[PDB]
Write a protein that binds this ligand. Sequence first.
Ligand code: LMT
Lengths: 96, 240, 1044, 96
Amino acid sequence: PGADAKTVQDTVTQVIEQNMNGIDNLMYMSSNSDSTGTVQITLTFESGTDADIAQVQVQNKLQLAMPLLPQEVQQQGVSVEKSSSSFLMVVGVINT
Amino acid sequence: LGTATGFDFELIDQAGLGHEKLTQARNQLLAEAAKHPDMLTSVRPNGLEDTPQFKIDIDQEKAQALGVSINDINTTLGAAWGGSYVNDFIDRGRVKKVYVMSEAKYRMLPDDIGDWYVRAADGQMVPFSAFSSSRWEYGSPRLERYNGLPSMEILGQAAPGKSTGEAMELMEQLASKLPTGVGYDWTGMSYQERLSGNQAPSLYAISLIVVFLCLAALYESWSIPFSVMLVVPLGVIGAL
Amino acid sequence: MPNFFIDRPIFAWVIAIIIMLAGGLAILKLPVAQYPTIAPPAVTISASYPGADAKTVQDTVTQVIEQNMNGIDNLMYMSSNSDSTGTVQITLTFESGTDADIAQVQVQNKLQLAMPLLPQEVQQQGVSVEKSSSSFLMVVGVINTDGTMTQEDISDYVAANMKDAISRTSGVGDVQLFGSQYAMRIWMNPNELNKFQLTPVDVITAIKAQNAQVAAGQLGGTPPVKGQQLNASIIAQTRLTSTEEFGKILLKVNQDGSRVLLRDVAKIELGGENYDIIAEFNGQPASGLGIKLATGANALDTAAAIRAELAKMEPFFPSGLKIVYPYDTTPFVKISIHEVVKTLVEAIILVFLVMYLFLQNFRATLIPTIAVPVVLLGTFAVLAAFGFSINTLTMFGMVLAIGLLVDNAIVVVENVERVMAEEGLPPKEATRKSMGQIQGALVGIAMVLSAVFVPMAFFGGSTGAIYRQFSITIVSAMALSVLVALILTPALCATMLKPIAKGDHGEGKKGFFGWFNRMFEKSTHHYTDSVGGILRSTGRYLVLYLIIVVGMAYLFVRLPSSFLPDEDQGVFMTMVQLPAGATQERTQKVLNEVTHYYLTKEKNNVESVFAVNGFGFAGRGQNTGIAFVSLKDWADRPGEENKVEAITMRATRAFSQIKDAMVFAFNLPAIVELGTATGFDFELIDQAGLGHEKLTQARNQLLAEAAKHPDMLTSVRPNGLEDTPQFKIDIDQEKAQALGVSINDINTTLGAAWGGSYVNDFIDRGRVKKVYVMSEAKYRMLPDDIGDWYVRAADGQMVPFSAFSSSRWEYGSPRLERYNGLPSMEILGQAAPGKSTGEAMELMEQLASKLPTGVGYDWTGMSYQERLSGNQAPSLYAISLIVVFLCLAALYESWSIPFSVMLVVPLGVIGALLAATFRGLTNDVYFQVGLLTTIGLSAKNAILIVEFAKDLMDKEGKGLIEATLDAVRMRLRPILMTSLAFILGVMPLVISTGAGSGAQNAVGTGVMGGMVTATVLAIFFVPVFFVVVRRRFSRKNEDIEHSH
Amino acid sequence: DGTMTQEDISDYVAANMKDAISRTSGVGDVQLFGSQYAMRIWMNPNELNKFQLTPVDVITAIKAQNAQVAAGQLGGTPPVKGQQLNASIIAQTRLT
Ligand SMILES: CCCCCCCCCCCCO[C@@H]1O[C@H](CO)[C@@H](O[C@H]2O[C@H](CO)[C@@H](O)[C@H](O)[C@H]2O)[C@H](O)[C@H]1O
């Protein structure tokens, strides 16, 4: 919260990236750090890789990098998730 | 997946170069790409341009002389202007966050900075303006990295009539003329071609060889299979 | 089938071709490895506590983690080292076949319960969980050939630009930097600190406050007021980037307004996170990456991927920077495999030549020959089908299978040839007649033969996977060659064989073939004459046979037994260990001596030496080091004296004359995680809170008692380090309270100055790196230096350490070991010459039962493996022999006639035993599988002999003796063709020098010896076997005529 | 033999048996029917009041005086060249 892109990159992104070692079947890794105080690191695995094993290996390497992150970032927590781009549907809720 | 005839290219800082030199190398690559409308079209950054930002320098000596601590100064600035997650409360049986932050009208403009006071050790309130100075500068609102190195993603496509393979070949050629320390890589749809497009030839070959061998077995003949294999273009011309 | 393809040769071809395409495609895609993986997965936990002594590490980290290690599937045991480098490694070792991914997941789920209980400084160093081999896959070295970069420069370059990408490469289980990344180093001066009434606590506070990255929000940030037109990020403090910026950190402003800057109380410089690891490549400054393979990953693929990654980095190197390859286990695998491929190709050429000697027409010799590549290539397809890899064992399976393969096609071609020499029938009809009489037998034989090889697919333990590689490869190839002989060979016979007129034996041919044919024909007659003779005696040969069986027994019980030969792999390692307390400088002196020896005394043999000071097999320390040695090619290192075993012996002997260090060169074992045989791995255990000193005393008593049994045990020794002097300092609580100095200030001042303290991060050329505060060297060298450090009391007074503390020398451990959660001390040793490992262990157990109360023991590693136990040989081969007899009984519809075939077994074994015995070889995996190969094939020769004889006595009239003679007459040529072709085919193996020639010699010698005696002897003894067994288990009336 | 009470027995099995049992083959979870020893400080509020102390002071002194300190080394790296002595500095250790 309230971090500029450089701050995000140099206290969060680089630290997580430096810890993404010893994970199987990684093809490549990319990230964005922006001035909305947000970072997303995406790791892409070989076709046929077990998506659950990929995710738990990532999340376990992250777990061990958490103590190296800023306190307020540890507070917000760092989400590790499977990446989909398709929704089955979007339910809107409005007040009229 | 793909933009069809599209490619997905990463410009990479391979040395100590930094965001500005990487941006200059990107602009150099983009200008050169633009000079080949015949081959390349719509090659462009995927990310964001540098923007003005407000640099504020805390004066350590003056803070120390006024008895104002750097932690008070920095949480005052950040909490007021950036907002700050304090802890949790319980709203109707669900745990939720508590945030402190300045009401909007006191964190809108540079003159507002001086309306925030910090308490010194001796009880006095010190306006932020007494121990800081500010200036405009440019910086990035979105920094990209690729395989752990600073990067800039570039999108584009083969010009009409041209193959994506052709368009990628030029991009590598243009990229080979960039400043020292600047490298590149293919990602996404492009990565899955420089690897997963070398296959088509050998798979079609296996198909054609096994077809011939099955036919030769059927007809007990090494030549008669040819009279069947010759049909292929007859359907294909009509589809085309 | 044979009839079908006799009419349809092109369909036959199409089947053969599809099989080869499938094999060919398997070969391009199949994993290649030296051996099947038989090593138990190991997960390692590593952590670091900067400036901690071994006990602090143990009681504050290691015990905490160990106590949370439970409910983990397939855990065999756990071991740990806590050392005065501040390092912990905990190794959890799992059952063979454990999914290493899940092992790692389950270990980490427990570890995360311990994590919050660990010291903060330990958590910030990052603890790691890895799943990899214990040994290095390769060492990637980096030098600067322009001398433009120091050791420290190169190390930082490597850490900052190369290591991470390599660390992320799939199959890379662990990466060790030989050197250290740069950190912002703040070297504190206690004199200057006291002059300005500051301490390391103030220095640390100032750095955290002034090397900061502040989140400051935005101008016009959401939610905004209405009408807002400006939106921009506020940028406040950012991480410092240079020594200059750190130097001007403001510590305080003096009473008269002057400033005290960080550079006024410290030297500030870019320097290593640590200064323990220093490497050289052939004497020059170097750094590097020691790379370990992730559990179960493919070594050749992982190495290819590492090279591809390094290739991406090279174009951006600073000037002079260069990658070198001082140590790589990879090449030997590729090379030794190709050497076997080469001998398989030579085998096919040799086969072609021997075929051309008996079949004297190019087209006719192509028939048996083409079978080889069809079968062999199809075997790769079957291996793919069953998830096997291309490895040393499957490749040698192919080779050992050559005789069994080629024999099916030879049996078919030869028999067709004879049918055309006996009756003058034309090719297409001759092969039909021929397939009619043998095809059933070929299929039957494939069944009995599978009984000799399938049982060893059921060996248990780690050893079993080895034998299963052979079993499946040989059974598959053998099954494929029967198929190939029923489909392709009959077709090729009916189309490519030259018509033979009746009664013709080419005796009236031209030059040499005409001569050869005349010799063979007369030899055949002199052959049949000889046998006809012995059949009239028989009693004589029955006795001679028992002689052979007895000698066979003799040789066998006196042939030593090994597992897999030790190969010269063109690389090896040298271990350097000085006593704890030794300095880095003395360790460098001993490394210089090691390096010197290889560069000057082994000029002709050693290509390079990558030596590292501060890293050893058991990990970081001032008193340890290692040298990685790469030899010149095997080709340029001719003779036994120039191979790894002779080199390492010479080297170790020369190094024994090095003062006050343990230095030895050793060749890496075939496996490793198998057991450098004769060796045992012992754990002494503190089972009752006895404590370190008592365990030591118990250890010493055991070591003493062991030494006085040199007949049984040799080199029984501790694996760890001896206690050393340590500086004990007591803080006086009352005095501190009285003076008003906080214990926290005291401890931080002490620890930061003498141990160093990781404060926070900074940005060095775009990359986040660490900032370290520590005393400059010259103020943390001497005991008296302690009192030059001052702490500030509450009332502002500077108080020297000497005012609130006292100190004394004492002894302590630099390396505390634990085994399965308890204090331990590992003890290594071996069986004395002539006595067995099991013997040595029982003695060790007997000695260990006499130690003081509360002291127990346990076996681990190689000694754990052998106690689940082996000795499954007798049973499995016993089953094998029974099933073979049962299969033969079905074949002959007789309970007795099988014995006439099975008696042939000793005749090849004796030749293999003689050959191995007098070449000084051993009873190992290659000897054993070779024996089954020889036995199978001569069993097969015997089967077709008595099958032919039995047919004569049954279908035709022919009495016993006549049938036997005409049967053996008919099967002499076919037998010789195969034997001579296989015996000559394996010459490449017996004559082999160079990469993997250890395995190749072991293979070839057994087979060649076995094959020669099997061929020469069975040709005479199988006739005896049949006539004697027929007579002994005779019914009522026969022999004298047989009706019709 | 009347030499161990229940609380003793429980400490013995917690401290010497439970860990190994819980790592034994096929064992999934292990419940101790009792409790391992801890060092028990049983405070008396009257005596605390008498000396004007609280549990806060007690807790503070225990963290300060029951400590295991990383204290560094003599002659550790990087050394002054020519250094002969390398030795661990041992400061406060845990009370026992
Ligand atoms: C007598 C006939 C049967 C005997 C011959 C059998 C040979 C068996 C030993 C082969 C060892 C396997 O070695 C294997 O070689 C092939 C061919 O270069 C490699 O194949 C590699 O190069 C080829 C092109 O040259 C590519 O199509 C392939 O994508 C690439 O991986 C494999 O990566 C390697 O693992």
